[PDB]
Amino acid sequence: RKQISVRGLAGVENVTELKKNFNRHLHFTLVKDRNVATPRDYYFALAHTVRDHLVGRWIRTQQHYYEKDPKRIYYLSLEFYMGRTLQNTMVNLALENACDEATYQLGLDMEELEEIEEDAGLGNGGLGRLAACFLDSMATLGLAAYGYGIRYEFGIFNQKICGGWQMEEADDWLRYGNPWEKARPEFTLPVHFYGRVEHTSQGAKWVDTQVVLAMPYDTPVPGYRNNVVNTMRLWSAKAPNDFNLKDFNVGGYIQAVLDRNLAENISRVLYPEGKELRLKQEYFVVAATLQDIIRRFKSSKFGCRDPVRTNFDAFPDKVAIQLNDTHPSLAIPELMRVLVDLERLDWDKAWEVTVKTCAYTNHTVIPEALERWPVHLLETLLPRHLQIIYEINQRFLNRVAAAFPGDVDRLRRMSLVEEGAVKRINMAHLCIAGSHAVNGVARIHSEILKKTIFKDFYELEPHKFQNKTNGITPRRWLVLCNPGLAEIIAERIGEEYISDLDQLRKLLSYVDDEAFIRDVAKVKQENKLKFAAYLEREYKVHINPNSLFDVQVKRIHEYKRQLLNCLHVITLYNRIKKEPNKFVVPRTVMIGGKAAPGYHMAKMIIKLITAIGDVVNHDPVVGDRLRVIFLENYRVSLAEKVIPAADLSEQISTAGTEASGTGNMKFMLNGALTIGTMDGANVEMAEEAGEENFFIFGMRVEDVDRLDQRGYNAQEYYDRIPELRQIIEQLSSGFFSPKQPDLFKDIVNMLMHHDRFKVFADYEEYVKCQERVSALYKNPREWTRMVIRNIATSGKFSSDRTIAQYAREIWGVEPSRQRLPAP
Amino acid sequence: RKQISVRGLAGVENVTELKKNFNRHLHFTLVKDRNVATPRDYYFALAHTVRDHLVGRWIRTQQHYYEKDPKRIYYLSLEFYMGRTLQNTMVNLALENACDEATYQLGLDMEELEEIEEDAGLGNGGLGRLAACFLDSMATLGLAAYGYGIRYEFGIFNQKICGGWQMEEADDWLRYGNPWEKARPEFTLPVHFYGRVEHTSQGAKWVDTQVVLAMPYDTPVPGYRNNVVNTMRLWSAKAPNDFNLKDFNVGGYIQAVLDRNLAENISRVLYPEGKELRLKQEYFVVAATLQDIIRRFKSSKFGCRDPVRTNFDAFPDKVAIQLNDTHPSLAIPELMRVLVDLERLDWDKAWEVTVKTCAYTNHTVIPEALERWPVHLLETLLPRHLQIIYEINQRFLNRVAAAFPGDVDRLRRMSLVEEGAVKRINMAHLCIAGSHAVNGVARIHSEILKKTIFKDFYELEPHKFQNKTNGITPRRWLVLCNPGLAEIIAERIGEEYISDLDQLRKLLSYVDDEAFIRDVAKVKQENKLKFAAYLEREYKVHINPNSLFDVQVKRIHEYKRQLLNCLHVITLYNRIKKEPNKFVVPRTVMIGGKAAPGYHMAKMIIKLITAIGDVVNHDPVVGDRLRVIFLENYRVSLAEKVIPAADLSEQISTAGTEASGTGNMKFMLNGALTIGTMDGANVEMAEEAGEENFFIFGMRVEDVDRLDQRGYNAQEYYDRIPELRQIIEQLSSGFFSPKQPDLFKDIVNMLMHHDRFKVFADYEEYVKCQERVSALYKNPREWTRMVIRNIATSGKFSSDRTIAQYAREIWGVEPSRQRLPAP
Ligand SMILES: O=c1[nH]cnc2c1ncn2[C@@H]1O[C@H](COP(=O)(O)O)[C@@H](O)[C@H]1O
Ligand SMILES: O=c1[nH]cnc2c1ncn2[C@@H]1O[C@H](COP(=O)(O)O)[C@@H](O)[C@H]1O
Ligand SMILES: *Cc1c(COP(=O)(O)OP(=O)(O)O)cnc(C)c1O
Ligand SMILES: *Cc1c(COP(=O)(O)OP(=O)(O)O)cnc(C)c1O
């Protein structure tokens, strides 16, 4: 027993012990051989050789949190955009240099193998990239945290462009195993759907439920060389498999083969309206988590630390639960029904707990997008939770009456129950009311929350509405994807920046140092060459390495604006062709992101960007002076290839729309210049960088508002501006689509007659700020120094900071970049 | 590359290294530590610590067959009855000693661990056990042998006895997985169902087919200390999972939810009439299997060795296919289809290869069991193979026209299509016609296939009909279950016997030596003591470890006549009550079997068998002289426990009914004397041991036919025998059944009016035999020496001989007990 220990099983940075484990895993773990193995096979030998090291420190970290029993923090997200784990674990564990030497002497190439990894198909965008950033900060800052989500077998679609139209293939990333996860069938747990609630004697009982099972999966998150490793625990839904003879529902009719497949596809796909499945997913991820939580509260030495009920008095002391946007809101009534009904605390002792345990991050501005289930839907698959949301609600509206007596119309606005045709439950209001700290994700967002969206909630409980500005981690997003820029930053000011990003302001001392200024420049010339190379070798084009890499990687939605960028492209194209011998600084325009199935505007925008691409790229006058590439299937591992490469980062949303913008910061720390309207995270970036270092343009929010107030009439702009006029008529006569003239019709009329987002208004000014971009790029010394200024200022944006601001003002816990001993 | 090698990966029988790998797997493979490891957890780390030694010589064995390129033979069977692998892998790998000592030091008990393992639910009976002894023998005699077949998730049922009535529970043995298998998602193959045959130009083209993917798992089977390890490849079904939006079958309707579950439970359930799922399961295994076979033929250094087509000319020199029973039969129409439609050989060359490739083992005697499929089922799901099977039939019936011209009635008796109401295709005739060796399984059984059942085929091709008498393997069924007998046989004659069993004849020189006699009776006393203990500790009873241990462990069918034996037990009962003080040899009668859900006699029988025992084992005058126990959920782990203990082997099937009987042979080998009719396997074991040393009795097969001839009129017996007349009236009045008198009413009538197997005929003489039995028992020295003659004559029944004969006589390859160098 004490002889069965984690202890003599490594020597780490040792090429000869990593070579001997690489050989044990190909053979014994994979049961393959060198006569029969593939690159996929050699990646799982190595994936497994790095994994041994990662779980050793996983074991010791978790033992060390049971024995020190700290406050535990549960990040609850319905999306975890991890993406690729091999190089990151080697960079956070110190093994990259020894893995590379050992594989190299085993006659293979790590860069090959690295590129066989499938991106962890668990996210689709922002909301999820961010949780995965915060897990890296959370593990580095010694915190005792947990990521909890649904594990999606089919990710969210793969993008393929066929005839310049987006096709959605499916992502089965799980296709040859995922070497980084450990399936725990032994901790499967019931999740209860439907039923009826029987009020028996001392409580209600939620009886006659269908059950789905929630099976957990453990993937370990390491911290930047601080020897802790925390946990990502994702839940697969699985059918009871009795459906055969056992139950005597069956035998006679197996049409309960439908429970089975409608059980199993809670875990099967990301999304992608008021659908029974979405709410089955939110309940499911929330329910199986809350048990696993309450379990460690009772179990984690606190069984013996009962002093009263294993008291839920010290439950908020040792637990926090973050509900990242309204997607886990039912963890508030689900916690209340476990406490009230299963344990037995009275309603107010349990409420005390709930509101001192839950905190909620908000990431939406337009009210048209806050969460909202119909009540009949809630009646039908969660009876007792619609009961609880009604009691939470009656109390809350009386609290409001203890505060603004006489105001009726406030009661009929701060209710969790919305009236119309179809009464709903407003999950936003739940979340505010059931928690102790609400925080938006940019200062202008948190403040417009307080000021407009959650105002009445601000007046009754002003103390709650915090803010925590969004952040990126310096590891994946500067050490790991841009090792070259990191190298020279360490040459001047050392490592500490990796684990402490405001230290990068020291770089302003070098602003005029010619060595630094040739070195930052060189590293980008490296990074562009390499991406220009991939732009032939996986997908195809003839990129010029010397052009201005202009990139817009943003979700393809109408407000997000690539239609602005297209008209500026067809303005350049048109210019180059009207005077084929003027010097125009050459540009590589690259746009990427995924439409969203069935949003057809979004789909005509992917078809425009490609047809433009087929004309400008193939016309001979334009030479190599302009090219328009659609980067296909944009995703986290493409993002770390292209962001190192870009020199201009098109941030151009109509102002007032964006909330924040985590990839904005990915371009700034990675030596690009942002052109952008003033909104979301452009503001605290411009503010850190000093506005003159930034290409801010366009209407500001107030100007949007005035235009609305007198009403935007898109024909006036169409009638002033002679270029705009022309490009519109080119779309329309099918200059860009000869076979189908009429093909962009709907994009003409969108523009011409119902632009909710004022493309034509920010036109004139947009191109003039581009002229200011072209014009500076044609003087390499000063452009490279504006870049030094954006980079030495990054600091305000590391997720190690945004997290500390969670730790201290919200979870109430202290971060610590202390090495834990280990291995 | 060349430095990626198996070489430095194991310092085997070394306790200090096995402790090391233990701790690697508990932690790194299971991602568990001693603070949270269960006995399952420690069971799995040990599984894996032993597995590393396995896969290492899997390795070496399989590299060696590729370099050497031997005839490698594919053993196809739809049920592989494996049961627990650990001790069997250690003993075979010689690791048992160092692992026990190792776990002893780690302070774990290996025996507590070895009982966690679930009994590999791939099998059901004889057909399946036979496949597992044959795979052991094929390793030991280093053949390039593959076992192929489906992976059943749900085994078959795990029985429970609730109130003396049988309950089938399900075997979800794969619940916490299986440490001995490697998933190969890499080699997932399509298998097509339904479709339509487009006769296009140079052939036929099977189009519009539904697909079911076969994904394979690999399991290693080790030899007896020879370092060859062979493969067991079991197939699992996986529906294609585009079923969401991709295909445009769906979106609109996902009612092809059904496709994906009707696909999935191909692999789910063992069976357990003309049900499309059996036919889809059988074709499932054939198709996947043969694509692996031809994949390995063209790959296995023969892609280099083409000379013509990568010709199938030499296919029978490198492949042997064994059709174990009629479940694999579409192997003959599927190998033609591939050869003829997919490659392009013509029908007479392709047929040449099939017949020289295919060989067929029959295990049935009664024509009523042979398998037969409606042509309307085969047209619907395999419409192409119905074609091939008719052309196979036509051309075979012209061969028969060659040979017996003028004959009309043989054409129609011999034909593959069968007429009546429901036109059938006779699968046994397919096999004979496209196989080059048809064989039975005991001498008599192969002769009555030659003489009655297949005789018109025996005339056209008398060369075809072989016999290869079954076998039991000495590793698992003597060494493993019985160490104590293993050991004392080894002092006297050495270890070669375990891999050479006929030399157990050497023992016959020690017949009168009292040291052997004594030792030989000591080990049984050991074995009985321990089995007596297991009958209290796991299940409960107060066995008298000195009693004559009478066990019948056979399939609860009428023809298996446990009822016979019950008439005899009730007889013993009645005597001990009539004559309280006469000296009677104390016995403990133990019966065991799984009913067969749906067969109502068998369910009524286990009921008898429990309540006889409720009566007698509680009744005060019988004391401890008689007890009757039912051995619940008989499976392989129970066989290796009760077959070591047994003194009397109850082998009583009506004669003419058995084809063979492998528990028969197991019992002989462990010094248990046989009471038994002159049937099945009993015949050649009587012939080995000498009839003086066998308790033969009851109506020989001749006498059966005579009794049928004139008519078995059971009442005559009732009316001669006063014990028989009495025990019938005891069953009937309710003596055994006082709360429902009338319960055994349908057993009493059966016996009395329509016993298809004549229990009453052999009653008188059966119990006369039984009296001989108890007499000899009451005479140790002469009891214990009959045993010695029996054990010493066991040689003909080691499966090593059955395979050696298959090897030389049907497959065309040489045996060799040579130790591959390795590890
Ligand atoms: O009370 C304990 N003492 C020591 N180690 C523990 C204890 N509880 C859990 N562990 C470790 O904690 C890990 C994570 O467990 P979880 O937090 O319960 O999911 C396990 O793999 C063990 O390594
Ligand atoms: O061409 C080969 N040379 C040497 N060993 C081979 C070759 N092909 C396969 N093997 C071995 O054969 C094993 C089984 O491959 P399979 O029989 O093709 O399924 C591999 O694990 C290797 O050990
Ligand atoms: C960081 C990141 C993101 C986050 O993207 P954005 O906030 O810039 O814009 P929206 O998509 O409009 O929210 C998205 N995708 C990837 C790959 C990534 O690394
Ligand atoms: C050897 C064996 C068998 C085989 O049983 P038999 O061949 O003796 O006769 P039937 O019972 O009629 O098939 C079945 N099950 C186990 C566990 C076993 O070891």
Please check whether residue B288 is in contact with residue B189, taking contact to mean a CB–CB distance below 8 angstroms: yes
- Tell me, what DSSP letter sits at residue B798? B
A177 Cα–ligand 1 center, Å: 25
Q: Is any atom of ligand 1 closer than 6 Å to the C-beta of A707? A: no
CATH homologous superfamily for the domain B1-471+799-822: Glycogen Phosphorylase B; (3.40.50.2000)
Tell me the sheet residues that pair with B319.
B72
Cα A61 from Cα A228, distance rounded (Å) = 5
CB contact under 8 A, A107 and B1: yes
* Type of residue at A72: R
| C-alpha span between B1 and A34 (Å, rounded) | 7
Which residue's alpha carbon is at the smallest distance from atom 4 of ligand 3? A126
Do B682 and B664 touch, CB atoms closer than 8 A?
yes
Give the C-alpha separation, B636 to B606, whole Å.
Answer: 20
Burial of B390 per CB tally in 10 Å (0-12, 13-18, 19+) = middle
Judged by CB atoms closer than 8 Å, whether chains meet at B185 and A172 is answered as: no
Give one DSSP letter per residue of A452-502, joined into a string: IISHHHHHH-TTTEEE----B-TIIIIIIT-HHHHHHHHHHH-SGGGG-GG
Count Cβ atoms below 10 Å from residue A388 Cβ, excluding itself: 24
Q: Are B551 and B649 in contact (CB under 8 A)?
A: yes
Q: How many CB pairs under 8 A join A and B?
A: 132
Q: Is B126 in the pocket of ligand 4 (CB under 6 A)?
A: yes
Residue B748 CA to residue B728 CA, distance in Å, equals 7
Compute, in angstroms, the gap from residue B485 CA to the centroid of ligand 4.
22
Which of A54, A55, A62, A235 maximizes ligand 1 atoms within 8 Å of its Cβ, making it the mutation to test the pocket?
A62
DSSP letter string, B684-702: HHHHHH-GGGSEE-S--HH
Q: B695 — phi, psi (to 5°)? A: -95, 70
Q: Which of A3, A175, A182 sits opposite B107 (nearest CB)?
A: A3
Give me the CATH topology for the region A1-471+799-823: Rossmann fold (3.40.50)
CB-count burial class (<10 Å; 0-12, 13-18, 19+) for A204: middle
Element housing B182 (H / E) = strand B182-183
CA pair distance B407, B419, nearest whole angstrom? 18
User: Which of A256, A287, A269 minimizes the C-alpha distance to A191?
Assistant: A287
User: Which contacts qualify for A496-499: CB closer than 8 Å, 24 or more apart?
Assistant: A498/A224, A498/A474, A499/A140, A499/A224, A499/A225, A499/A226, A499/A474, A499/A800, A499/A817
Q: What is the rounded CA–CA span in Å between residue B652 and residue A429?
A: 78
Structural contact between residues B799 and B470, judged by C-beta atoms closer than 8 angstroms: yes
Round to whole Å and give the CA distance between B689 and B691. Answer: 6
Same fold, B1-471+799-822 and B472-798: yes
Residues of B in contact with A5 (CB under 8 A): 23, 33-34
End-to-end CA distance of chain A: 20
* Strands of the sheet with B424-426, listed across from one edge: B372-374, B424-426, B417-418
Amino acid at B517: I
Q: What tokens does A807 get?
A: 């730790």
CATH number of A472-798: 3.40.50.2000
Q: Closest-lying ligand to the alpha carbon of B56?
A: 2
Residues 6+ apart with CB under 8 A from A583: none
Mutation to test the B interface, candidates A3, A28, A182, most B Cβ within 10 Å:
A28
Closest CA to B384 of B210, B199, B239, B191: B199
Other C-beta atoms lying within 10 Å of the C-beta of residue A215: 19
Task: Find where tokens 């033609």 sit.
Answer: B336
Decide if A26 contacts A112 (C-beta within 8 A). no
How far, in whole angstroms, is CA B179 from its chain's centroid? 23
Angle between helices A483-493 and A514-537 (to 10 degrees): 170
- Angle, vertex CA A416, rays to CA A413 and CA A421, nearest 5: 75
Q: For residues B352 and B361, give the distance between their C-alpha atoms in angstroms, rounded to a whole number.
A: 20
- Across the interface, whether the CB atoms of A27 and B3 are under 8 A apart is answered no
What's the CA-to-centroid distance between A272 and ligand 3, angstroms?
15
Q: What is the resolution of this structure in A?
A: 2.8
What does the alpha-carbon distance between residue A606 and residue A591 come to, in Å, rounded to a whole number? 9
Residues 6+ apart with CB under 8 A from B424: B372, B373, B374, B375, B417, B418
Residues B22 and B45: beta-carbon distance below 8 Å = yes
The secondary structure element, H or E, covering residue B425 is strand B424-426
CB B630 within 8 A of CB B609: yes
**Backbone phi, then psi, for A677, in 5-degree steps?**
-85, 175
What are the structural domain ranges in chain A?
1-471+799-823, 472-798
Location of structure tokens 């390859």:
B813
> B269 contacts in A (CB within 8 Å)?
244
Q: What is the number of the ligand 4 atom nearest to the C-alpha of B661?
A: 7
Which ligand 1 atom is the nearest neighbour of the CA of A218?
Answer: 19
Please state at what angle helix A722-732 crosses helix A745-754, rounded to 10 degrees: 140
User: How many Cβ atoms sit within 10 Å of the Cβ of residue B540?
Assistant: 9
Residue ranges of the annotated binding site of B for AMP are 33, 66, 295-304
Q: Are residues B106 and A6, on separate chains, in Cβ contact within 8 Å?
A: no
Question: What does the alpha-carbon distance between residue A312 and residue A354 come to, in Å, rounded to a whole number?
Answer: 10
Q: Answer yes or no: do B185 and A170 touch at CB < 8 A.
A: no
Q: What does the block give as tokens for B218?
A: 């690999």
Structure tokens at A458: 């601000």
Phi, psi of A641 (to 5 degrees): -95, -50
CA–CA separation, A627 and A617 (whole Å): 5
Task: Report the separation in Å between the CA atom of B506 and the middle of ligand 4, taken as the mean of its atom positions.
Answer: 28
Nearest alpha carbon to residue B112 among B24, B38, B26: B38
CB contact under 8 A, A23 and B9: yes
* Three-class DSSP category at B23: helix
Residue of B nearest to A27 (CA): B6
DSSP secondary structure, A585-631, as one string: --EEEEEE----TT-HHHHHHHHHHHHHHHHHHH-STTTTSEEEEE-
- DSSP count for chain B of H helices, then E strands: 31, 23
Question: Measuring from atom 13 of ligand 2, which residue has the nearest CA?
Answer: B62
Structure tokens at B460: 């056209």
Name beta bridge partners: A274: none
With CA atoms as reference, report the closest residue to B696 among B681, B683, B679, B677: B677
CA–centroid distance, residue A35 to ligand 2 (Å): 7
Q: How many angstroms separate the CA atoms of A21 and A19, rounded?
A: 6
Helix or strand run (H / E) with residue B99: helix B96-106
Which of the residues of A are catalytic?
363, 554-555, 560, 662, 666
Alpha carbon of residue A384 to chain centroid: 32
DSSP code for A418: E
Bridge partner list, B590? B551, B629
The first and second tokens of residue B820, run together, are: 């591959």
Structure tokens, A368: 């048209």
